XYZ file of N, CA and C in Angstrom:
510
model
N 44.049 33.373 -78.839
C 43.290 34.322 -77.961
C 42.902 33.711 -76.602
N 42.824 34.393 -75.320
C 42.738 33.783 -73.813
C 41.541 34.812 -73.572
N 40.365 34.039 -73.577
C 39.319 34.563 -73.253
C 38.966 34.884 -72.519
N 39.867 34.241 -71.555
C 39.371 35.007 -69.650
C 39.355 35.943 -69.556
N 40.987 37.020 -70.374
C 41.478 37.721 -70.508
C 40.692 38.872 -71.233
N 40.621 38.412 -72.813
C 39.942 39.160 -74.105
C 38.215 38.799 -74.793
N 37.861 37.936 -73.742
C 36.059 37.324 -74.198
C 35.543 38.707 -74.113
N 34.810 38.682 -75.359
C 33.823 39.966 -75.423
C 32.456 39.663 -74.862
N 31.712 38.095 -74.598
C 30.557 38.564 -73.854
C 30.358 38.805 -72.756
N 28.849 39.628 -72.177
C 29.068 40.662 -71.147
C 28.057 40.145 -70.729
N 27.912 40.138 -69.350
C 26.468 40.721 -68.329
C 27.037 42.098 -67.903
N 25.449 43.080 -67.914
C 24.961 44.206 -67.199
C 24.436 44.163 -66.358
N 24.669 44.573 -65.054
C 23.869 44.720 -64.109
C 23.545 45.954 -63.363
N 22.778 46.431 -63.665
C 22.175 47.801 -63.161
C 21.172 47.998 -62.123
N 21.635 48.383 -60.895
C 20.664 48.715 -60.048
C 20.112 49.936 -59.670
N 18.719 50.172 -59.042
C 17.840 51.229 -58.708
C 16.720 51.035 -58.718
N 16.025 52.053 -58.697
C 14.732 51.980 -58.250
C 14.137 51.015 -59.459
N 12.368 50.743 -58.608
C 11.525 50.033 -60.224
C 11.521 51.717 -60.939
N 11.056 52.759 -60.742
C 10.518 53.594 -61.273
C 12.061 54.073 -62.294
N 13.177 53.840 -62.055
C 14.095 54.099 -62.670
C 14.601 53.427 -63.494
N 14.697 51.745 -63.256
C 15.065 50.757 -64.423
C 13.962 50.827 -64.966
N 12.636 50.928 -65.209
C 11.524 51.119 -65.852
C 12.358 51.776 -67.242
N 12.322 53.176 -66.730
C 12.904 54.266 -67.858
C 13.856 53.764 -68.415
N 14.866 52.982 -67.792
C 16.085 52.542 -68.415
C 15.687 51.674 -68.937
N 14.889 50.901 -68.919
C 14.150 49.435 -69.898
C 13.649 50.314 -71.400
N 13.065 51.159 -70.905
C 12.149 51.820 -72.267
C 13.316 52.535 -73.204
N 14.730 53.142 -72.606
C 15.463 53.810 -73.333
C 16.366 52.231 -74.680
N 16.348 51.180 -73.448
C 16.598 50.283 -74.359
C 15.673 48.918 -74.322
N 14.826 49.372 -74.830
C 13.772 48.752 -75.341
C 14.019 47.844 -76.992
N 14.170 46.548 -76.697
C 14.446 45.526 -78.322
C 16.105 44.961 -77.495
N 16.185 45.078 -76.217
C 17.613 44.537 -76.183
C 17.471 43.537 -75.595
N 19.158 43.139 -74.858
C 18.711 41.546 -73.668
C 18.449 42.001 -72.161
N 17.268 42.364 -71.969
C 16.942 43.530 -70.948
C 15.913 42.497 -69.975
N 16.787 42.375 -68.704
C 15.478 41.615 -67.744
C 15.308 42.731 -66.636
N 14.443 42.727 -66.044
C 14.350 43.355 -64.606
C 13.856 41.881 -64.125
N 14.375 42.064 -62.910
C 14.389 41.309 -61.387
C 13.818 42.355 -60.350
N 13.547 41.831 -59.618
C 13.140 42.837 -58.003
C 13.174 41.596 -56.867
N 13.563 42.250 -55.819
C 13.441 41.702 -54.012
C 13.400 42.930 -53.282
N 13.425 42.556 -52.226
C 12.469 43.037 -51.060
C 13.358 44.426 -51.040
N 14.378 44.543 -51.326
C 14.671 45.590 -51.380
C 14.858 46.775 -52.567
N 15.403 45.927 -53.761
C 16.196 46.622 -54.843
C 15.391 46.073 -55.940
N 15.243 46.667 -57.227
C 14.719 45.994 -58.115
C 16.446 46.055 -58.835
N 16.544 45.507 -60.074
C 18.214 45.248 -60.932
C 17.223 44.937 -62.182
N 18.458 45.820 -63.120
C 18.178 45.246 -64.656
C 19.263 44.145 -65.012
N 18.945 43.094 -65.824
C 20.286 42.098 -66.407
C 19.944 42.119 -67.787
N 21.174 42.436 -68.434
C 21.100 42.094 -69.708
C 22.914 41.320 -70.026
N 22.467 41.031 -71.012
C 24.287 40.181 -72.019
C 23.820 40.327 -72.903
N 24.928 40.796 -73.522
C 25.771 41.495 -74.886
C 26.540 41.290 -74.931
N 27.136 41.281 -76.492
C 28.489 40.999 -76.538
C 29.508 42.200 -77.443
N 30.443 42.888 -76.923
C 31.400 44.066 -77.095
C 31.195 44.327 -75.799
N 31.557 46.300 -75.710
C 31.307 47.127 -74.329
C 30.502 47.593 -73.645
N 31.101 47.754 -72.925
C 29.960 48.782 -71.857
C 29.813 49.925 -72.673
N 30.941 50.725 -73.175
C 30.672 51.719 -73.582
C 30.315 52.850 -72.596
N 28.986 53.729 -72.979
C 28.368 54.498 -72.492
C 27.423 54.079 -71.064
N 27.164 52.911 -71.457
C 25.929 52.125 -70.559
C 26.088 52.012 -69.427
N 25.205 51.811 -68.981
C 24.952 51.923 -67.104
C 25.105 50.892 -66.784
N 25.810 50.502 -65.011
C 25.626 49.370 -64.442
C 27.303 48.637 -64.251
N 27.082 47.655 -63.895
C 28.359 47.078 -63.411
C 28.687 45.782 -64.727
N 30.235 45.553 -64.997
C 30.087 45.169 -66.156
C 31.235 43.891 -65.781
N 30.328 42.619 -66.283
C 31.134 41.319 -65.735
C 31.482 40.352 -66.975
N 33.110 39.586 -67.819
C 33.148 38.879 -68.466
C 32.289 37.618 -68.311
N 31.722 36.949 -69.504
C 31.425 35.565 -69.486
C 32.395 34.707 -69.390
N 32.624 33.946 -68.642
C 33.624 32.982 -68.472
C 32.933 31.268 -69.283
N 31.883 31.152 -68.944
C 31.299 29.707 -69.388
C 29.344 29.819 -68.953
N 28.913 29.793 -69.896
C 27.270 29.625 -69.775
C 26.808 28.654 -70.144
N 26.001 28.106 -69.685
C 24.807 26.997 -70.324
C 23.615 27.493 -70.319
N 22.336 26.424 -70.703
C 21.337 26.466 -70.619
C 20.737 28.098 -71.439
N 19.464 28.106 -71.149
C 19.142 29.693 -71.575
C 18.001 30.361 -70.698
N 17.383 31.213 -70.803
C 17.156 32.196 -69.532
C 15.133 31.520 -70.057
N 14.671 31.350 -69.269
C 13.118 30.903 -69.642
C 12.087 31.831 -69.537
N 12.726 32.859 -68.814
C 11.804 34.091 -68.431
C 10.623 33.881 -67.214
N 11.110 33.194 -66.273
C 10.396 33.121 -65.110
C 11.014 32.879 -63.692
N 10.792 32.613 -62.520
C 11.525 31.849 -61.505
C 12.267 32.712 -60.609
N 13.445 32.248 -60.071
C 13.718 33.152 -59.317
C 15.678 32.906 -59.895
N 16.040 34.589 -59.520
C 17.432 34.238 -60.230
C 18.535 34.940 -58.839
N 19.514 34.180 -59.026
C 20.955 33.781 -57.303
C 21.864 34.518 -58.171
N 22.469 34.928 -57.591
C 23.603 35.938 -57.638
C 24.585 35.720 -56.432
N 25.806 34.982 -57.186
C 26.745 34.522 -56.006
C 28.035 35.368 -56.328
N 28.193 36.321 -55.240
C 29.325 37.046 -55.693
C 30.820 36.089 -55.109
N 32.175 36.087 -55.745
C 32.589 35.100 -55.083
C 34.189 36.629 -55.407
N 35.505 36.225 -54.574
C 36.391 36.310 -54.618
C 37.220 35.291 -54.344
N 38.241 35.555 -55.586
C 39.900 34.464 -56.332
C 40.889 34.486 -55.777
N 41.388 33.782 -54.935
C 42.726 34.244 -55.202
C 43.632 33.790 -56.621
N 44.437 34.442 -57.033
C 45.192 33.754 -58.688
C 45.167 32.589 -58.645
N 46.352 31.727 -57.203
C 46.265 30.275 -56.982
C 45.232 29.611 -56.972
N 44.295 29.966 -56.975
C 42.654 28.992 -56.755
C 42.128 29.090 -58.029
N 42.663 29.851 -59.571
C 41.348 30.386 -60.299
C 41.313 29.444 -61.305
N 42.679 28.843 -61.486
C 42.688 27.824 -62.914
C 41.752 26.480 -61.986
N 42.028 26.050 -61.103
C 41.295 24.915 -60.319
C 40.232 25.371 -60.229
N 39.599 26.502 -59.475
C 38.655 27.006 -59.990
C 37.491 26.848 -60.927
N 38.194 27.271 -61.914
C 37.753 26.889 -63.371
C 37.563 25.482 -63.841
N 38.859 24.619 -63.789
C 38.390 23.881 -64.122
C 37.883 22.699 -63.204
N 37.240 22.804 -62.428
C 36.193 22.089 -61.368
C 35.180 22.697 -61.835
N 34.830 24.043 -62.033
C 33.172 24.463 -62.770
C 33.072 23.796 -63.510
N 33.889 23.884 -64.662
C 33.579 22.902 -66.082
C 33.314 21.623 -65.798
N 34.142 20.827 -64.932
C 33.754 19.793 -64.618
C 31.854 19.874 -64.005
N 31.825 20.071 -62.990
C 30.510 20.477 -62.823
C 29.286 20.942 -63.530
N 29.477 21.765 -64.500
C 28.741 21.935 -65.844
C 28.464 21.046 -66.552
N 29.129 19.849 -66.573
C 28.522 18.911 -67.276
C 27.535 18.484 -66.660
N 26.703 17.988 -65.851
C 25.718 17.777 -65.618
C 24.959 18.754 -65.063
N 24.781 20.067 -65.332
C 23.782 20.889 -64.950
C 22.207 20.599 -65.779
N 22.605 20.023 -67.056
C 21.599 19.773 -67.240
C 20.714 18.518 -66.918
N 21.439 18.101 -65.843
C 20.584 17.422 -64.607
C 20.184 17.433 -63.694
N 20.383 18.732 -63.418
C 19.993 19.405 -62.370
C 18.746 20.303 -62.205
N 17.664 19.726 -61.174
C 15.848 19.608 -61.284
C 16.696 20.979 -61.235
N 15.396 22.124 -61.703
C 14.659 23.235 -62.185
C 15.502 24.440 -62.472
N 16.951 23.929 -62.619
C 18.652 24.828 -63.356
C 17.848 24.985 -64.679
N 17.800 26.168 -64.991
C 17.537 26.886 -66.737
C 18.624 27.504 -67.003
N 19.368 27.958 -66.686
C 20.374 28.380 -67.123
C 21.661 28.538 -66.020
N 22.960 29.329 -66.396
C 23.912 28.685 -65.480
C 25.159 30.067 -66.111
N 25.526 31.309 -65.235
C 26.734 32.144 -66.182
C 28.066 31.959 -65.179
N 29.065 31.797 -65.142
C 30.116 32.037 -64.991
C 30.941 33.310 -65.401
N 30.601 34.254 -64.344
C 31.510 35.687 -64.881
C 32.358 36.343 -63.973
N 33.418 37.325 -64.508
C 33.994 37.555 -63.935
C 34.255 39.002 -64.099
N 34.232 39.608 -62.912
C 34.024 41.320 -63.107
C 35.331 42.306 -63.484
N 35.325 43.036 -64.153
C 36.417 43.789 -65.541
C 37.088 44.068 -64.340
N 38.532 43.229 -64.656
C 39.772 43.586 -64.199
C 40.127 43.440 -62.684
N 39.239 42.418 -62.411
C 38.947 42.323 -60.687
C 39.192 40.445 -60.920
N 39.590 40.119 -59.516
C 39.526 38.820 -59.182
C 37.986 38.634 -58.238
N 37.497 39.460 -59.091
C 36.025 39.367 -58.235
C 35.521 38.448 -59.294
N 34.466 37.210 -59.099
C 33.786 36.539 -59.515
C 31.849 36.371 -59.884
N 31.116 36.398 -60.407
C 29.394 36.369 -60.360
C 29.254 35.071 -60.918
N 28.801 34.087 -60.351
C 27.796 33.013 -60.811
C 26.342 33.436 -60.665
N 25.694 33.531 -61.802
C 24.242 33.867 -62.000
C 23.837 32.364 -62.217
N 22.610 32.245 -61.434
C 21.952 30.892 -61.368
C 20.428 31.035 -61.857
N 19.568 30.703 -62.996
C 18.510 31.245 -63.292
C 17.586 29.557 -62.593
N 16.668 29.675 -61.852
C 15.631 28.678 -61.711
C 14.464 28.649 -61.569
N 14.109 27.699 -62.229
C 12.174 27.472 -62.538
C 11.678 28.064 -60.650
N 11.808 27.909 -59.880
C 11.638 28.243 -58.910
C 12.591 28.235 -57.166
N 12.374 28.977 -56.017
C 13.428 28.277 -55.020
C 13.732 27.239 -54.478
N 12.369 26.165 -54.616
C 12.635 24.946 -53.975
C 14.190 24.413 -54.594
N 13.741 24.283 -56.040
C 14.726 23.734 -56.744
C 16.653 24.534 -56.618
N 16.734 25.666 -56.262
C 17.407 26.070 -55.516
C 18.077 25.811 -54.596
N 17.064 25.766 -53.443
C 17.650 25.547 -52.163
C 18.130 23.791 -52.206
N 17.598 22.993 -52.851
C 17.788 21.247 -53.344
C 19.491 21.485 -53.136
N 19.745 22.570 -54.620
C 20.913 22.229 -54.852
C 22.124 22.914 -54.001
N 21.716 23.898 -52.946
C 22.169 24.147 -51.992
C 23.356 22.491 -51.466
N 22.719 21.513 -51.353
C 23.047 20.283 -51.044
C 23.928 19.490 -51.361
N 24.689 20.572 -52.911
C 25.427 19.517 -53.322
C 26.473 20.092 -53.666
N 28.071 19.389 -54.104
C 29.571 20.416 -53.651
C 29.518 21.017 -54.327
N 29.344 21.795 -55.782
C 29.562 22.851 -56.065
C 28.820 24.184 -55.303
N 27.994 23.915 -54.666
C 27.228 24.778 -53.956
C 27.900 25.005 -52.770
N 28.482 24.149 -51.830
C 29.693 23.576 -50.328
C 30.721 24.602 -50.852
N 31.293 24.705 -51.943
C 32.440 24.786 -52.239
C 32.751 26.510 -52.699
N 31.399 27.007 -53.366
C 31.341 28.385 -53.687
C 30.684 29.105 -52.061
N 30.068 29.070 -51.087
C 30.341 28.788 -50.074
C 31.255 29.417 -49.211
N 32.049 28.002 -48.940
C 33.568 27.776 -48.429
C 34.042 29.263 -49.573
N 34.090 29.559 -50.658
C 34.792 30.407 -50.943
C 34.547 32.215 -50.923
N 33.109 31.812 -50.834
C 32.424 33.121 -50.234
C 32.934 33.937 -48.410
N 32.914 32.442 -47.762
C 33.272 32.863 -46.534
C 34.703 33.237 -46.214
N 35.531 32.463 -46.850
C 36.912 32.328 -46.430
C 37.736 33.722 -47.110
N 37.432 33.941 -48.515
C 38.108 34.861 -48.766
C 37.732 36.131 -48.860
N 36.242 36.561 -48.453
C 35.934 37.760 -48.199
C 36.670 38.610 -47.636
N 37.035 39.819 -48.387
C 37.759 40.855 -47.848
C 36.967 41.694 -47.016
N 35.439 41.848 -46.692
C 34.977 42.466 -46.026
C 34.336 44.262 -46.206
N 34.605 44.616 -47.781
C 34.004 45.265 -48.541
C 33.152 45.277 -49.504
N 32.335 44.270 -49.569
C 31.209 43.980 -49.935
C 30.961 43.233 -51.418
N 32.237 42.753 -51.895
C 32.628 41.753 -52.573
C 32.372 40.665 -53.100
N 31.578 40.165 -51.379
C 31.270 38.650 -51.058
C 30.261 38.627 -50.591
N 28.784 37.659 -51.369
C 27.501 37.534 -51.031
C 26.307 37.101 -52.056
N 25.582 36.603 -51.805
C 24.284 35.516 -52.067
C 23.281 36.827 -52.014
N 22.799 37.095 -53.228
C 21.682 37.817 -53.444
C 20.760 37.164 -54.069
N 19.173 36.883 -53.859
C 18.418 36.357 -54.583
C 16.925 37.370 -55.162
N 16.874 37.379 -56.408
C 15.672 38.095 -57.003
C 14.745 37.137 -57.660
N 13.544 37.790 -57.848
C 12.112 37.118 -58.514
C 12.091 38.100 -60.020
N 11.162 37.341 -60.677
C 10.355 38.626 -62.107
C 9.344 38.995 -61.275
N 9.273 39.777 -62.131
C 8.398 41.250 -61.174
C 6.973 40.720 -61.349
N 5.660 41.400 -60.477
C 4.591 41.302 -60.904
C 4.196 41.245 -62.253
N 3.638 40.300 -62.710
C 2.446 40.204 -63.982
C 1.705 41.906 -64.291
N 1.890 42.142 -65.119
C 1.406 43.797 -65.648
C 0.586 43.188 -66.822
């Protein structure tokens, strides 16, 4: 089996209003259900593993995860585009790199995904906070996703660095 290909786990990502992922939190209420918010958009994230199915939102393979989600901090969203020739190197330079994430100050977790049937790419970056973030801004896997953000953007909105917080304390 080639998992790039046939991996059943998933991130969801659903955007809209707070007053709307609210409702959509409560319809699935007991699942892997986060809300995020920034200055503009609030987003639900959840992973599961099978389909989308019925469900709302944009739907991206797991390619390689570490760490686990702590429930605080602030979470990066690096949208990236592949070309075919770049994706096995690609790949395996992340992996390489993954090995020491868990040395990396205030990294909690770490997804590698890739969006259904697209050479479109999501690295989700979960961290204790932005300092620790912007640190690793500093170092080549960060240079390098980057360099690949800029260079191969097609210019339909593909390609880009989104960053969210957890919402106010209720």
């Amino acid at each position: 089996e080639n998992l790039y290909f046939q991996g059943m786990k998933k991130v969801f990502i659903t955007t809209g209003t707070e007053h709307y992922l609210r409702q959509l939190m409560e319809n699935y209420i007991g699942e892997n259900v986060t809300l995020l918010q920034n200055f503009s958009q609030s987003l639900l994230y959840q992973e599961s593993t099978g389909e989308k199915l019925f469900q709302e939102g944009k739907e991206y393979r797991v390619l390689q995860s570490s760490g686990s989600l702590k429930g605080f901090g602030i979470v990066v969203f690096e949208y990236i585009q592949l070309r075919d020739e770049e994706i096995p190197i690609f790949l395996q330079m992340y992996q390489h790199a993954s090995l020491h994430f868990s040395e990396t100050p205030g990294l909690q977790s770490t997804k590698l995904t890739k969006a259904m049937n697209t050479n479109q790419f999501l690295i989700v970056s979960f961290w204790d906070s932005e300092v620790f973030f912007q640190e690793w801004k500093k170092t080549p896997l960060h240079k390098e996703i980057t360099s690949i953000m800029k260079k191969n953007n097609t210019q339909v909105g593909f390609s880009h660095e989104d960053i969210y917080h957890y919402p106010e304390f209720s």
